[PDB]
Design a protein around this ligand. Sequence first.
Ligand code: 2FQ
Lengths: 257, 243
Amino acid sequence: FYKREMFDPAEKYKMDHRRRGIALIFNHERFFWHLTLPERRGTCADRDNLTRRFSDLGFEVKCFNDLKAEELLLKIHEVSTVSHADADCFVCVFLSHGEGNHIYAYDAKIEIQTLTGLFKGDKCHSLVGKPKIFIIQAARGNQHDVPVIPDTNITEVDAASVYTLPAGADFLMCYSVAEGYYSHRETVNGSWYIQDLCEMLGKYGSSLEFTELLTLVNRKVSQRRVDFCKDPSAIGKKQVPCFASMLTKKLHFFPKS
Amino acid sequence: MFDPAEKYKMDHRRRGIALIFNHERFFWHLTLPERRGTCADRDNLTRRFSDLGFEVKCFNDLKAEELLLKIHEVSTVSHADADCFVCVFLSHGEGNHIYAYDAKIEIQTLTGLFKGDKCHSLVGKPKIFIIQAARGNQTNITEVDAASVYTLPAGADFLMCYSVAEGYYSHRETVNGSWYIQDLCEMLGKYGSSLEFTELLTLVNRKVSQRRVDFCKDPSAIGKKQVPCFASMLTKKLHFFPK
Ligand SMILES: Cc1ncc2cc(N)c(=O)n(C)c2n1
């Protein structure tokens, strides 16, 4: 008895390599004054929450805080050019503000496609046919601060701004919010999306197919309301996340043997 | 209590409506090439969706005004006794637009009609758009079109399914139909009544992405790979078990 090469409706990505793989986290809390972007209080909670959840899933987690665009590009290029032959997959998280096709580093915008492009095909051969998962918590920073240089739990509400695009074969692009909706971040507890993502990872990450888990996150986040007492006008500003999948098989994070 | 395996309730009187807008020819002023093979797609889709219990309504080569009128009429009837709604576009496209016979239409205008406040009877129900649309170029022949349509999501409980993502190429056989539609329909026929729908779509991703582009009859087409994608804002598991 063996499996002939017949089309299998339940085929899974092989997750039995020596290592789960690397999870990069790019955490941005502050920005160069010329960008006129507001601070992102609560993002450190997001970063720490994600670090614990992904590490429990077997990932080697590397966090970088407030990198300049050049440092960011350099660092992610370094990861893309080493061998991932002994890894199951790759995860990259961006926690920042964004606009259109761009995510902000500390000092400048970076095009998402340039970031994901580094892991396409034979640019990164050892990840070909392996899941490449980008998680993006990035929206429009409320620009009611000045173009000059400069502990209550507040919920900040940001309009969706980042195009929720896919990235190539075996890429999964996960977005905190879709166009027409609003992203929420609590200044102490962190972002709604990341909080809910992390809760689901801890509870179900080790058995549930990952896109099914993401769907749970869609439901959880979309069901959140702000206590209407708090101002100003977050009433009716619903958040619905989304994911764009070009995965070709089922993705599980069963505990590694 | 929060249920990790919660399914959309698919036990209504009717599965729901599946609209298909099929575009084979375009007004001369648009200077767009014909889409031979698209009628095979239409028939294939009609069969698979009707087998799933859908009430299928097909429309060929509608002008933009007629198309808008039809989709608005559908958005304004009651879906209270329906499980869900499906809308398929077979045409050329560009950016946020799909072409009708005589003009472009914004996808957001199309999907917006079925959003909560516009179509109260579809609230909390799956709204699935399937889009076979790419850039029209300037015996079974394979036509190859560059991806052109932005692969965007559409709101709560919408699922947006695209034949091709940016940087890849969409293929259509003049007799057999589009690669994407063929593979989707094959999966619908084999697994549509049991498999969770996004899981089925993932199979389609695999099938289409595995079609070889090494040895084309047209040497122009070599290396022009096709990978589809889907953008999900579904909030529950979607099945089409027999009603
Ligand atoms: C890749 C890309 N370039 C430009 C745009 C411009 C847009 N308006 C858009 O919605 N999307 C998704 C885009 N996506």
